[PDB]
Every structure is written in structure tokens, then in C-alpha cells.
Ligand SMILES: CN(C)c1ccc2c3c(cccc13)C(=O)N(CCNC(=O)CCCC[C@@H]1SC[C@@H]3NC(=O)N[C@@H]31)C2=O
Ligand SMILES: CN(C)c1ccc2c3c(cccc13)C(=O)N(CCNC(=O)CCCC[C@@H]1SC[C@@H]3NC(=O)N[C@@H]31)C2=O
């Protein structure tokens with residue numbers, strides 16, 4: 438709860454070397470910035486999202502998600518990613534996610550508008 | 563741009579009868595509430611997300627995404643959904659999305675933590 | 688069972704105008720050809736897959752999936768799609784699917800190797 | 813080509829401890845069996861799929877996919893999984909996949925019919 442808040446807030450790194458900095462609010466909000474090590478991305482981008490401010494205490498992870506639109510002062514990649522996953526606490530804390538990356542397309546190209554992938558975030562690296 | 567802002571802001575309905583009410587901010591923010599016609603959901607839930615405040619003008623859609631954590635004053639479904647998609651404007655304006663719904667799980671059950679689906683939102687119904 | 692076999696076997700069409708011709712075997716096999724109305728595709732491509740030869744009889748759909756590699760005598764698109772979904776029988780019989788389309792990539796590009804989408808197949812159109 | 817055939821054919825293991833045994837045919841076929849270490853699964857299940865019998869030689873992976881219906885002599889889990897991904901050869905050869913697992917459902921429950929995940933297969937473990 439406040440446990441999750443404290444667990445989630447901070448800097449995370451994924452397997453690609455991207456950096457996710459986030460504050461979890463007591464109200465279930467996630468707010469922060471994201472810097473992608475790959476793709477059409479430079480510097481930091483705003484992120485917002487939500488999390489289960491009251492997960493179970495049977496050892497279950499904590500559900501959460503967030504979005505980045507790939508526009509900032511330096512680039513506009515006409516796209517947006519959402520990550521959906523769960524926070525697991527402890528000595529090797531992790532956010533395990535799957536993500537959808539959608540590009541704005543013509544109607545003709547809409548069938549190929551969305552990439553899918555997975556990112557695992559840790560507190561080190 | 564301001565076009566997208568004006569296009570996106572408002573009430574949308576999906577094929578299931580769910581209701582998405584959203585304000586698009588000039589800064590690329592999405593803020594609002596979501597009421598799901600199905601699943602472990604009651605009343606409205608906070609939503610936040612982002613959108614490409616400056617899509618292309620070659621007739622491409624506008625990328626966007628948002629999250630809902632399935633906790634409010636009435637229920638806690640220990641889960642969170644992200645929708646990723648694009649807004650298409652005009653007489654039959656649409657937000658075409660794919661979504662990931664993750665439940666908090668034990669580590670044993672993490673492989674089955676995430677549902678995937680698609681929702682199409684329109685301004686009527 | 689033999690019901691499913693009879694239900695599934697035949698020609699289906701999706702919302703894009705693609706054509707899926709399939710034989711369901713008594714052993715749970717699916718075999719046939721696919722012709723895509725869109726993308727880097729021409730003529731027919733082999734398809735194979737499986738289905739639950741013994742679904743429930745509580746009105747549940749019948750789970751199934753199949754793959755196409757996008758290589759034939761005319762083109763090689765260095766890619767393969769899998770469709771996962773369920774057959775629903777009756778007067779407006781449907782196969783409702785989600786699909787993953789993966790392209791062979793460099794290791795650098797693997798994070799963007801896979802598109803996701805949804806196709807609905809019917810017996811007419 | 814024959815390279816891919818030789819690369820792919822054999823026994824693979826994923827991070828969960830599941831075992832995938834496959835023969836790649838010269839015609840682009842994949843045929844074999846799958847034994848899942850997790851879920852509603854026992855013993856081996858038939859699998860079929862396809863692969864790009866002629867990938868590029870710029871170091872790109874080889875696209876492929878396959879399906880398992882979760883019915884055999886011991887169990888019927890009313891479901892089917894498709895894996896979509898790419899084979900990468902060499903000293904630490906890998907098949908990197910994403911998967912869709914669909915359960916037969918009522919029409920009411922169709923929105924939650926499909927799980928999504930990722931599996932990485934290697935030749936050892
Ligand atoms: C239609 N058709 C041929 C395309 C043409 C162009 C594009 C696409 C795209 C998606 C789907 C198809 C196309 C797409 O997303 N785009 C925009 C790309 N946008 C970007 O590169 C922004 C960085 C995204 C980084 C990802 S987020 C998940 C992962 N985790 C990380 O930390 N980093 C990676 C295109 O141009
Ligand atoms: C591990 N294993 C056996 C499960 C056990 C329980 C659950 C799950 C879930 C996901 C995956 C597996 C399980 C899951 O999400 N859950 C929480 C469900 N949470 C909810 O029902 C909240 C409403 C979500 C409504 C969806 S959002 C996309 C779509 N579009 C709409 O407008 N409405 C629908 C479980 O309990």
C-alpha cells in the first residue's frame with residue numbers, strides 16, 4: 438500500500454538499458470519520465486500511469502501500467518507505448534511488463550500499426 | 563494538434579457498452595474516467611494517459627494510450643489495463659485500440675497474468 | 688467434435704477481404720491455405736494449425752490456432768503470422784482471432800520484430 | 813535454408829522448463845511435440861507450424877510459428893496456444909517467441925479469452 442508506493446517509486450532499468458523514473462502517489466497515480474535506449478527516441482519523455490494502491494498480501498505482485506507518447510522537445514515519433522505488468526518487491530525487485538507500441542497510420546496501414554514486446558525492469562543496471 | 567485535443571476530448575463508447583470520458587490537455591496529457599460494462603468493475607475508475615499532441619497531416623491517425631487501475635471506492639480487482647491505439651477523426655470518429663490487462667499474481671502464476679484484447683471506441687452508442 | 692470438424696472445415700473471410708481455406712482433421716489438425724488481401728503477400732500460402740477436437744457443450748467456443756509463413760513461389764516476406772482464437776458455430780458462425788506477425792530481424796531490431804492485431808472471420812463476404 | 817532446417821530441428825527448452833521437440837521440413841513445415849512444465853498440461857501434445865525456409869543472410873533471425881491444442885489422451889484444457897517468433901543460430905542459439913493462449917469461452921466471456929506472454933527457448937536446460 439504505502440509499501441507499494443515506497444517499492445515502486447524510484448529509478449528502474451530494463452534489459453535494453455532504458456531508464457524509467459517514477460513516483461507512485463498515495464492515490465494510485467504513477468508520474469515520471471522515460472528514456473529509451475532504442476528506437477526513435479531521445480532524452481526523456483513524460484509518462485503517466487496507475488497502479489493498484491492496495492494489492493493482496495498473499496505474495497501476489499502489484500498490477501500497474503503506464504503510457505509514454507513519443508513526443509518531446511527533440512523528436513516526434515508519431516507513436517505511443519503502454520506497458521502493462523506487475524511490480525514484485527524484495528531483494529531483487531522487478532517490474533515485469535508487456536508493452537504495445539502503436540504508430541499513427543493511414544487507414545490502409547492500420548492493420549500493421551501496433552508492435553508488441555516485453556520489458557523486465559530492475560533497480561540495478 | 564488543437565485539432566486532436568478537440569477531437570479526442572469527450573465521451574467515447576466501446577462495442578461492449580463501456581464508457582470512456584477523457585480530456586486531452588494541450589501538453590499531451592489524457593485524464594478522465596472509465597466505466598466498464600464487463601468484468602470485475604463498478605462505477606468509474608480514474609484513467610490517465612498520453613497522446614501525440616502533434617500527429618502528421620497525411621491523414622494518419624493520432625497515437626495514444628491510457629491506463630486504468632481497477633481499484634476505486636467500491637471494488638479492488640487487483641489488476642490494471644492499458645489501451646494502446648490511435649484516434650481517427652471525421653464524421654465517424656474512432657479510437658481503435660488493443661489492450662493488455664494484467665492481474666497481480668504469485669510468481670508461480672505470472673505466466674498467466676496478462677489478458678490481451680481489442681476495443682473500438684466511437685462517439686455514439 | 689465431428690460437429691467442430693464440420694463447422695470449421697471450409698472457406699472463411701476476414702474484415703480485410705483475406706481468404707482462409709481450411710480442413711479440420713478428426714485428429715485435431717488444421718491444414719489449408721491463406722490468401723492475404725493486404726501486406727507483402729501474393730497468392731496462397733500454406734497454413735497448418737490445431738484445434739480442440741472436443742470443446743465443451745455449454746455453448747463455449749472451440750479454441751484453435753494456425754500459422755502461415757509468408758513464403759511461397761512468388762514472394763518471401765521473411766515473416767510468419769500465428770492466429771489464436773475460437774470458432775463459434777451457428778447461423779452467423781465466426782472465428783474470432785488475435786494474431787502475432789513476426790519478422791526476421793537483426794538482434795538490434797528484435798524489440799520491434801512483432802506486430803499484433805485482430806481478425807474476425809466469417810463464412811460470407 | 814538447409815541451414816535453418818538443421819538449426820531448428822531438435823529439442824528446445826524454455827525458461828519455465830517446458831520441452832519443445834521439432835522437425836523442420838525442407839518445405840517450411842514444423843512438426844513435433846510440446847510438453848509444458850506449467851498449467852493444465854500433461855505429457856506431450858502435438859504441434860505443427862511453419863518457418864521461413866529461406867531467411868535473409870544479413871544476420872537476421874528466421875521467422876516461424878507453431879500451435880498446440882491442449883488436448884491429448886490425458887487432458888483436455890479447452891485451449892490452444894500459438895507461438896510467434898524467430899530462430900537465431902550460433903553457439904547460444906535461441907528461439908525468441910511471444911505467445912497467445914486462447915480458451916474456448918461463452919460469448920459473454922470472450923473479451924477475457926486470450927492470455928499473452930513470452931517464451932525464450934534454448935538448446936540447453
Ligand atoms: C506501419 N509501419 C510499416 C510502421 C512504420 C513506422 C513505424 C511503425 C511502428 C509500429 C508499427 C508499424 C510501423 C512504430 O511504432 N513506429 C514508431 C516508433 N517509435 C519509437 O521508436 C519510439 C521509441 C519506442 C521504444 C520501444 S517502447 C518498447 C521498448 N522498450 C524500451 O525501453 N524501448 C522500446 C514507426 O515509426
Ligand atoms: C492467473 N489467473 C488464473 C487469473 C485469475 C484472475 C484474474 C486474471 C486476470 C488476468 C489473467 C489471469 C487471471 C485478470 O485480469 N483478473 C482481473 C480482472 N479485472 C477486471 O475484470 C476489471 C475489469 C476489466 C475490463 C476489461 S479491460 C478491457 C476490456 N474493455 C472494457 O471496456 N472492459 C474489458 C482476474 O481476476
Ligand SMILES: CN(C)c1ccc2c3c(cccc13)C(=O)N(CCNC(=O)CCCC[C@@H]1SC[C@@H]3NC(=O)N[C@@H]31)C2=O
Pocket residue numbers: 548701703705722723724725726727728757764765766768786788789790792796799800801802804806
Ligand atoms: C523491424 N521493422 C522496422 C520492420 C520492418 C519490416 C517488417 C516488419 C514486420 C514486423 C515488425 C517490424 C518490421 C513485418 O511483419 N514485416 C513482414 C510483413 N509481412 C507481410 O506483409 C505478410 C502479410 C501479413 C498480412 C497480415 S497477417 C495479419 C493480418 N490479417 C490478414 O489477413 N492480413 C494481415 C516487415 O516487412
Ligand SMILES: CN(C)c1ccc2c3c(cccc13)C(=O)N(CCNC(=O)CCCC[C@@H]1SC[C@@H]3NC(=O)N[C@@H]31)C2=O
Pocket residue numbers: 673826828830847848849850851852853882889890891893911913914915917921924925926927929931
Ligand atoms: C475466461 N477466464 C476467466 C478463463 C478461465 C479459464 C481459462 C482461461 C484461459 C485464458 C483466458 C481466460 C481464462 C486459458 O487459457 N485456460 C486454459 C489453460 N490451458 C493450459 O493451462 C494449457 C497449458 C498452457 C501452458 C502455457 S502455453 C504458454 C506458456 N509457455 C509454456 O511452455 N507454458 C505456458 C483456462 O483454463
